[PDB]
Design an enzyme around this catalytic site. Sequence first.
Site, PDB file in Angstrom:
ATOM      1  N   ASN A   1     -14.426 -57.612-105.121  1.00 22.88           N
ATOM      2  CA  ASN A   1     -14.916 -56.633-106.083  1.00 22.88           C
ATOM      3  C   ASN A   1     -15.125 -55.328-105.317  1.00 22.88           C
ATOM      4  OD1 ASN A   1     -15.412 -58.557-108.443  1.00 22.88           O
ATOM      5  ND2 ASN A   1     -16.687 -59.494-106.837  1.00 22.88           N
TER       6      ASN A   1
ATOM      7  N   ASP B   1     -18.543 -52.989-105.798  1.00 22.88           N
ATOM      8  CA  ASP B   1     -19.814 -53.215-105.118  1.00 22.88           C
ATOM      9  C   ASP B   1     -19.694 -53.941-103.789  1.00 22.88           C
ATOM     10  OD1 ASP B   1     -19.488 -55.936-105.939  1.00 22.88           O
ATOM     11  OD2 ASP B   1     -21.649 -56.138-106.229  1.00 22.88           O
TER      12      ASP B   1
ATOM     13  N   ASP C   1     -16.084 -63.036-104.838  1.00 22.99           N
ATOM     14  CA  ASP C   1     -16.344 -64.252-105.628  1.00 22.99           C
ATOM     15  C   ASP C   1     -15.594 -65.376-104.930  1.00 22.99           C
ATOM     16  OD1 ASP C   1     -17.708 -62.786-107.663  1.00 22.99           O
ATOM     17  OD2 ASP C   1     -15.765 -62.175-108.453  1.00 22.99           O
TER      18      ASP C   1
ATOM     19  N   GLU D   1     -12.660 -69.429-114.587  1.00 19.96           N
ATOM     20  CA  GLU D   1     -13.019 -68.723-113.364  1.00 19.96           C
ATOM     21  C   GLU D   1     -11.947 -68.760-112.284  1.00 19.96           C
ATOM     22  OE1 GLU D   1     -15.234 -66.635-112.767  1.00 19.96           O
ATOM     23  OE2 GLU D   1     -16.880 -67.005-114.169  1.00 19.96           O
TER      24      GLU D   1
END
Length: 130
Positions: free
Chosen positions: A46, A49, A53, A35
């Site tokens: 992102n 949308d 993160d 990750e």
Amino acid sequence: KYFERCELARTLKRLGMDGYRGISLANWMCLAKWESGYNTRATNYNAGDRSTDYGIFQINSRYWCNDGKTPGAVNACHLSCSALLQDNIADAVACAKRVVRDPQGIRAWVAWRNRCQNRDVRQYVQGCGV
């Protein structure tokens, strides 16, 4: 901060992650590795949308933490996303635990399915004393 492998393994173990909801420490290690590369400051916007993160486990702002700029987002971990950017990972671990209490468990992170599920993850905790 970027953690060293075994340093993180013991840090997670001390925070009670070993076998939490049946998830082994090596699974969490594999998750953090893929990750963020063990980087607590890791961030990923992102554009699709409008979410972001955050931190070592790359927890998303749409549902888990509040950053005030994600449209119609919730804050299931009840944390400012800033808490997921600290060198101290206690808050990120509390939130990662919150995520896995849901139906999916560790499968919540697509990266875990992609790079850890049905993989030999022993290497992550070997020699760490955990």
